[PDB]
Design a protein around this ligand. Structure first.
Ligand code: TBS
Ligand code: TBS
Ligand code: CL
Ligand code: CL
Ligand code: NA
Length: 333
Protein backbone atom coordinates (compact mmCIF):
# COMPACT_ATOMS: atom_id res chain seq x y z
CA UNK A 1 0.00 0.00 0.00
CA UNK A 2 1.32 3.55 0.81
CA UNK A 3 4.56 4.45 2.66
CA UNK A 4 4.36 3.81 6.47
CA UNK A 5 3.87 7.14 8.34
CA UNK A 6 6.66 8.63 10.51
CA UNK A 7 6.79 11.13 13.43
CA UNK A 8 9.73 13.12 14.87
CA UNK A 9 11.09 11.41 18.07
CA UNK A 10 11.53 14.90 19.66
CA UNK A 11 9.69 18.28 19.44
CA UNK A 12 6.90 16.39 17.61
CA UNK A 13 3.98 18.70 18.58
CA UNK A 14 5.75 22.03 19.37
CA UNK A 15 4.06 23.93 16.45
CA UNK A 16 0.60 22.46 17.35
CA UNK A 17 0.92 24.05 20.86
CA UNK A 18 1.92 27.46 19.34
CA UNK A 19 -0.55 30.10 18.10
CA UNK A 20 -1.38 29.71 14.34
CA UNK A 21 0.53 32.99 13.58
CA UNK A 22 3.85 31.29 14.72
CA UNK A 23 3.94 28.71 11.85
CA UNK A 24 1.21 29.96 9.40
CA UNK A 25 3.80 31.97 7.42
CA UNK A 26 1.44 32.42 4.38
CA UNK A 27 -0.70 34.76 6.61
CA UNK A 28 2.40 36.69 7.89
CA UNK A 29 2.14 40.43 6.99
CA UNK A 30 5.64 41.86 6.22
CA UNK A 31 6.33 45.59 6.88
CA UNK A 32 8.90 46.27 4.06
CA UNK A 33 11.55 48.92 4.91
CA UNK A 34 13.57 51.18 2.54
CA UNK A 35 16.87 49.63 1.22
CA UNK A 36 18.15 53.30 0.95
CA UNK A 37 18.78 53.24 4.77
CA UNK A 38 21.67 50.98 3.54
CA UNK A 39 24.56 51.67 1.11
CA UNK A 40 26.05 48.54 -0.57
CA UNK A 41 29.88 48.38 -0.13
CA UNK A 42 30.86 45.17 -2.01
CA UNK A 43 29.62 41.75 -3.25
CA UNK A 44 30.23 38.95 -0.67
CA UNK A 45 28.59 36.02 -2.49
CA UNK A 46 26.11 34.81 -5.16
CA UNK A 47 23.51 32.00 -4.67
CA UNK A 48 20.64 30.39 -6.68
CA UNK A 49 18.08 32.72 -4.97
CA UNK A 50 20.11 35.86 -3.97
CA UNK A 51 23.09 38.24 -4.36
CA UNK A 52 24.77 38.95 -0.95
CA UNK A 53 26.47 42.31 -0.20
CA UNK A 54 28.35 43.94 2.65
CA UNK A 55 26.50 47.23 3.34
CA UNK A 56 26.53 50.16 5.79
CA UNK A 57 23.49 51.27 7.79
CA UNK A 58 23.79 55.08 7.07
CA UNK A 59 21.97 56.01 10.36
CA UNK A 60 24.53 54.37 12.76
CA UNK A 61 27.44 53.52 10.33
CA UNK A 62 27.00 49.82 11.43
CA UNK A 63 28.19 47.10 8.97
CA UNK A 64 25.37 44.74 7.80
CA UNK A 65 24.93 41.97 5.20
CA UNK A 66 22.20 42.55 2.58
CA UNK A 67 20.73 39.50 0.80
CA UNK A 68 18.98 40.90 -2.34
CA UNK A 69 16.49 38.15 -3.31
CA UNK A 70 16.26 37.10 -6.98
CA UNK A 71 12.55 36.96 -8.02
CA UNK A 72 10.68 34.11 -6.17
CA UNK A 73 7.18 33.08 -4.89
CA UNK A 74 5.92 35.57 -2.21
CA UNK A 75 5.21 32.32 -0.20
CA UNK A 76 8.94 31.28 -0.02
CA UNK A 77 9.97 34.86 1.06
CA UNK A 78 7.35 34.95 3.91
CA UNK A 79 8.52 31.45 5.02
CA UNK A 80 12.20 32.55 5.33
CA UNK A 81 11.25 35.87 7.07
CA UNK A 82 8.88 34.14 9.55
CA UNK A 83 11.51 31.45 10.41
CA UNK A 84 14.26 34.13 10.85
CA UNK A 85 11.88 36.21 13.04
CA UNK A 86 10.93 33.08 15.10
CA UNK A 87 14.62 32.09 15.62
CA UNK A 88 15.99 35.65 16.18
CA UNK A 89 18.28 35.77 19.28
CA UNK A 90 18.66 31.95 19.26
CA UNK A 91 22.13 30.43 19.92
CA UNK A 92 24.38 30.65 16.81
CA UNK A 93 21.38 31.70 14.60
CA UNK A 94 22.07 34.56 12.10
CA UNK A 95 20.20 37.74 13.24
CA UNK A 96 17.72 39.31 10.81
CA UNK A 97 18.08 43.11 11.36
CA UNK A 98 15.62 44.44 8.72
CA UNK A 99 13.40 43.59 5.72
CA UNK A 100 13.57 46.18 2.88
CA UNK A 101 12.59 46.82 -0.76
CA UNK A 102 14.46 48.93 -3.35
CA UNK A 103 12.04 51.88 -3.91
CA UNK A 104 12.62 51.68 -7.74
CA UNK A 105 12.96 47.92 -8.63
CA UNK A 106 10.74 46.81 -5.63
CA UNK A 107 13.18 43.83 -5.25
CA UNK A 108 12.92 42.46 -1.67
CA UNK A 109 16.10 42.19 0.48
CA UNK A 110 16.92 40.73 3.93
CA UNK A 111 19.38 42.69 6.14
CA UNK A 112 21.44 40.63 8.63
CA UNK A 113 23.71 41.82 11.48
CA UNK A 114 27.27 41.65 10.02
CA UNK A 115 29.30 38.40 10.21
CA UNK A 116 32.65 37.62 8.44
CA UNK A 117 32.16 36.31 4.82
CA UNK A 118 34.44 33.33 5.84
CA UNK A 119 32.28 30.17 5.30
CA UNK A 120 33.23 26.93 7.20
CA UNK A 121 34.16 25.17 3.88
CA UNK A 122 37.21 27.56 3.60
CA UNK A 123 38.89 26.10 6.77
CA UNK A 124 37.02 22.90 7.97
CA UNK A 125 39.71 20.79 6.13
CA UNK A 126 42.50 22.39 8.36
CA UNK A 127 41.03 22.29 11.96
CA UNK A 128 42.59 20.55 15.04
CA UNK A 129 40.71 17.62 16.71
CA UNK A 130 39.61 19.97 19.54
CA UNK A 131 38.28 22.71 17.17
CA UNK A 132 36.20 20.19 15.11
CA UNK A 133 34.56 19.12 18.44
CA UNK A 134 34.18 22.83 19.46
CA UNK A 135 32.51 24.03 16.20
CA UNK A 136 30.38 20.82 15.87
CA UNK A 137 29.03 21.54 19.42
CA UNK A 138 28.27 25.19 18.31
CA UNK A 139 26.38 23.91 15.21
CA UNK A 140 24.43 21.47 17.48
CA UNK A 141 23.34 24.42 19.73
CA UNK A 142 21.79 26.08 16.61
CA UNK A 143 20.10 22.79 15.45
CA UNK A 144 18.75 21.83 18.90
CA UNK A 145 17.39 25.41 19.17
CA UNK A 146 15.70 25.54 15.70
CA UNK A 147 14.38 21.92 16.20
CA UNK A 148 13.05 22.93 19.69
CA UNK A 149 11.35 25.90 17.89
CA UNK A 150 9.60 23.51 15.41
CA UNK A 151 11.94 24.29 12.46
CA UNK A 152 14.18 22.05 10.32
CA UNK A 153 16.99 23.86 8.40
CA UNK A 154 17.12 21.29 5.52
CA UNK A 155 20.33 22.84 4.02
CA UNK A 156 23.01 22.07 6.65
CA UNK A 157 26.38 22.18 4.84
CA UNK A 158 29.74 23.94 5.33
CA UNK A 159 28.75 26.93 3.07
CA UNK A 160 25.79 27.69 5.45
CA UNK A 161 28.08 27.86 8.54
CA UNK A 162 29.74 31.32 8.90
CA UNK A 163 32.71 31.16 11.34
CA UNK A 164 34.74 33.97 12.96
CA UNK A 165 37.70 31.69 13.90
CA UNK A 166 39.50 34.64 15.65
CA UNK A 167 36.53 34.98 18.12
CA UNK A 168 35.55 31.24 17.96
CA UNK A 169 32.00 32.37 16.94
CA UNK A 170 29.69 30.48 14.53
CA UNK A 171 26.36 31.36 12.79
CA UNK A 172 24.04 28.97 10.90
CA UNK A 173 22.87 31.01 7.85
CA UNK A 174 20.57 30.67 4.77
CA UNK A 175 17.18 29.67 6.16
CA UNK A 176 15.69 29.85 2.60
CA UNK A 177 15.03 26.04 2.54
CA UNK A 178 13.95 25.83 6.23
CA UNK A 179 10.44 24.56 7.04
CA UNK A 180 8.15 24.15 10.05
CA UNK A 181 7.82 20.54 11.24
CA UNK A 182 4.17 19.35 11.44
CA UNK A 183 3.47 15.70 12.35
CA UNK A 184 2.10 13.84 9.27
CA UNK A 185 3.13 16.62 6.81
CA UNK A 186 4.73 15.38 3.55
CA UNK A 187 7.66 17.60 2.48
CA UNK A 188 9.45 18.33 -0.81
CA UNK A 189 12.39 15.89 -1.16
CA UNK A 190 14.09 18.40 -3.60
CA UNK A 191 15.99 20.20 -0.78
CA UNK A 192 19.65 20.23 0.42
CA UNK A 193 22.78 19.95 -1.80
CA UNK A 194 23.52 16.50 -3.33
CA UNK A 195 26.41 15.47 -1.00
CA UNK A 196 24.37 16.30 2.19
CA UNK A 197 20.97 14.80 1.11
CA UNK A 198 19.65 12.21 3.61
CA UNK A 199 18.52 8.79 2.32
CA UNK A 200 14.84 9.92 2.93
CA UNK A 201 15.37 12.56 0.16
CA UNK A 202 17.13 10.08 -2.19
CA UNK A 203 14.43 7.31 -1.95
CA UNK A 204 11.59 9.94 -1.97
CA UNK A 205 10.29 9.44 1.62
CA UNK A 206 8.37 12.72 2.20
CA UNK A 207 7.31 12.34 5.89
CA UNK A 208 10.74 13.37 7.24
CA UNK A 209 11.66 15.59 10.21
CA UNK A 210 14.48 17.40 12.11
CA UNK A 211 16.55 14.13 11.79
CA UNK A 212 17.31 15.19 8.15
CA UNK A 213 19.64 17.92 9.55
CA UNK A 214 21.44 15.28 11.69
CA UNK A 215 22.32 13.27 8.50
CA UNK A 216 23.72 16.47 6.85
CA UNK A 217 25.69 17.12 10.09
CA UNK A 218 27.10 13.54 9.91
CA UNK A 219 28.19 14.18 6.27
CA UNK A 220 30.02 17.37 7.45
CA UNK A 221 31.67 15.57 10.42
CA UNK A 222 32.82 12.61 8.22
CA UNK A 223 34.31 15.15 5.71
CA UNK A 224 36.24 16.96 8.52
CA UNK A 225 37.58 13.99 10.58
CA UNK A 226 38.54 11.96 7.42
CA UNK A 227 39.62 15.05 5.33
CA UNK A 228 37.44 13.71 2.46
CA UNK A 229 35.42 16.43 0.64
CA UNK A 230 32.70 15.45 0.14
CA UNK A 231 32.44 12.19 2.16
CA UNK A 232 29.64 10.76 -0.11
CA UNK A 233 30.66 11.91 -3.63
CA UNK A 234 27.69 11.03 -5.91
CA UNK A 235 27.70 11.93 -9.66
CA UNK A 236 23.92 12.63 -9.33
CA UNK A 237 21.03 11.96 -6.83
CA UNK A 238 20.82 8.22 -7.86
CA UNK A 239 24.60 7.60 -7.56
CA UNK A 240 24.52 9.57 -4.23
CA UNK A 241 22.53 6.66 -2.65
CA UNK A 242 24.99 4.13 -4.22
CA UNK A 243 27.92 6.06 -2.58
CA UNK A 244 26.08 5.80 0.79
CA UNK A 245 25.21 2.08 0.19
CA UNK A 246 28.94 1.27 -0.43
CA UNK A 247 29.72 2.59 3.13
CA UNK A 248 26.55 1.91 5.22
CA UNK A 249 25.85 -1.36 3.30
CA UNK A 250 22.73 -2.53 1.40
CA UNK A 251 21.27 -4.78 4.20
CA UNK A 252 20.35 -1.78 6.44
CA UNK A 253 19.14 0.12 3.28
CA UNK A 254 16.69 -2.64 2.19
CA UNK A 255 15.57 -3.10 5.87
CA UNK A 256 14.89 0.70 5.95
CA UNK A 257 12.96 0.50 2.59
CA UNK A 258 10.95 -2.50 3.97
CA UNK A 259 10.27 -0.78 7.36
CA UNK A 260 8.65 2.34 5.76
CA UNK A 261 7.20 0.40 2.75
CA UNK A 262 9.08 2.81 0.40
CA UNK A 263 8.51 2.32 -3.39
CA UNK A 264 12.15 2.45 -4.63
CA UNK A 265 12.54 4.17 -8.08
CA UNK A 266 13.26 1.33 -10.62
CA UNK A 267 16.56 3.10 -11.66
CA UNK A 268 17.96 1.83 -8.27
CA UNK A 269 17.36 -1.90 -9.10
CA UNK A 270 20.64 -2.30 -11.12
CA UNK A 271 22.98 0.32 -9.50
CA UNK A 272 22.68 -0.27 -5.67
CA UNK A 273 24.05 -3.86 -5.93
CA UNK A 274 25.02 -5.62 -2.65
CA UNK A 275 27.55 -4.06 -0.18
CA UNK A 276 28.83 -4.84 3.34
CA UNK A 277 28.68 -2.11 6.00
CA UNK A 278 32.31 -0.86 6.02
CA UNK A 279 34.22 -0.32 9.29
CA UNK A 280 35.17 3.41 9.62
CA UNK A 281 38.87 2.34 10.10
CA UNK A 282 38.74 1.93 6.24
CA UNK A 283 38.77 5.81 5.86
CA UNK A 284 41.60 6.42 8.45
CA UNK A 285 45.11 7.19 7.04
CA UNK A 286 48.33 9.01 8.20
CA UNK A 287 47.00 12.53 7.23
CA UNK A 288 43.63 12.26 9.16
CA UNK A 289 44.48 9.80 12.04
CA UNK A 290 45.00 12.76 14.50
CA UNK A 291 41.29 13.81 13.93
CA UNK A 292 39.86 10.23 14.32
CA UNK A 293 39.23 8.69 17.79
CA UNK A 294 36.88 5.90 19.01
CA UNK A 295 34.67 8.80 20.36
CA UNK A 296 34.54 10.51 16.90
CA UNK A 297 33.67 7.21 15.10
CA UNK A 298 31.04 6.17 17.72
CA UNK A 299 29.43 9.67 17.34
CA UNK A 300 29.58 9.66 13.48
CA UNK A 301 28.10 6.12 13.33
CA UNK A 302 25.05 7.35 15.34
CA UNK A 303 24.39 10.27 12.88
CA UNK A 304 24.78 8.31 9.59
CA UNK A 305 21.79 5.90 9.74
CA UNK A 306 19.37 5.22 6.86
CA UNK A 307 16.47 5.12 9.37
CA UNK A 308 15.92 8.83 10.28
CA UNK A 309 14.28 7.66 13.61
CA UNK A 310 17.60 5.86 14.55
CA UNK A 311 19.78 9.04 14.26
CA UNK A 312 20.81 10.99 17.38
CA UNK A 313 18.71 14.09 18.05
CA UNK A 314 20.72 17.36 18.34
CA UNK A 315 20.48 17.19 22.19
CA UNK A 316 21.46 13.44 22.33
CA UNK A 317 24.45 14.35 20.03
CA UNK A 318 25.46 17.18 22.48
CA UNK A 319 25.55 14.57 25.35
CA UNK A 320 27.92 12.18 23.41
CA UNK A 321 31.37 11.46 24.97
CA UNK A 322 32.94 13.13 21.85
CA UNK A 323 31.97 16.56 23.42
CA UNK A 324 32.89 15.85 27.14
CA UNK A 325 36.08 18.06 26.98
CA UNK A 326 34.18 20.88 25.11
CA UNK A 327 31.32 20.78 27.73
CA UNK A 328 33.92 20.84 30.61
CA UNK A 329 35.87 23.83 29.10
CA UNK A 330 32.57 25.73 28.46
CA UNK A 331 31.70 25.53 32.23
CA UNK A 332 35.38 26.48 33.00
CA UNK A 333 34.95 29.72 30.90
BR1 TBS B 1 18.34 47.01 -0.21
C1 TBS B 1 18.89 47.29 -2.00
C2 TBS B 1 18.24 46.66 -3.05
BR2 TBS B 1 16.78 45.50 -2.73
C3 TBS B 1 18.66 46.88 -4.36
BR3 TBS B 1 17.76 46.01 -5.78
C4 TBS B 1 19.73 47.73 -4.61
N1 TBS B 1 20.34 48.12 -5.75
N2 TBS B 1 21.33 48.96 -5.43
N3 TBS B 1 21.36 49.11 -4.11
C5 TBS B 1 20.38 48.36 -3.56
C6 TBS B 1 19.96 48.14 -2.25
BR4 TBS B 1 20.83 48.99 -0.81
BR1 TBS C 1 28.28 35.12 1.95
C1 TBS C 1 26.54 34.96 2.68
C2 TBS C 1 26.25 35.54 3.92
BR2 TBS C 1 27.60 36.49 4.86
C3 TBS C 1 24.97 35.44 4.47
BR3 TBS C 1 24.57 36.23 6.15
C4 TBS C 1 23.98 34.74 3.77
N1 TBS C 1 22.67 34.47 4.04
N2 TBS C 1 22.17 33.76 3.03
N3 TBS C 1 23.12 33.57 2.11
C5 TBS C 1 24.26 34.16 2.55
C6 TBS C 1 25.53 34.26 1.99
BR4 TBS C 1 25.86 33.45 0.30
CL1 CL D 1 29.10 23.51 1.24
CL1 CL E 1 34.75 -3.76 7.18
NA1 NA F 1 43.51 8.55 16.45
Amino acid sequence: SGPVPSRARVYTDVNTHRPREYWDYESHVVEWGNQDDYQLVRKLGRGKYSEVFEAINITNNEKVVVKILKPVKKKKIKREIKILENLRGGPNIITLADIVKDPVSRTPALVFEHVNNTDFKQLYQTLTDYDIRFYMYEILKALDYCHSMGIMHRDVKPHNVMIDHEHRKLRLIDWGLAEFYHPGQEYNVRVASRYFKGPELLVDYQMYDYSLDMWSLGCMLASMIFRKEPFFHGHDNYDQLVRIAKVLGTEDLYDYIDKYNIELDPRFNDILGRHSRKRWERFVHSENQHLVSPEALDFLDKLLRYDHQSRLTAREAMEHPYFYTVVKDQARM
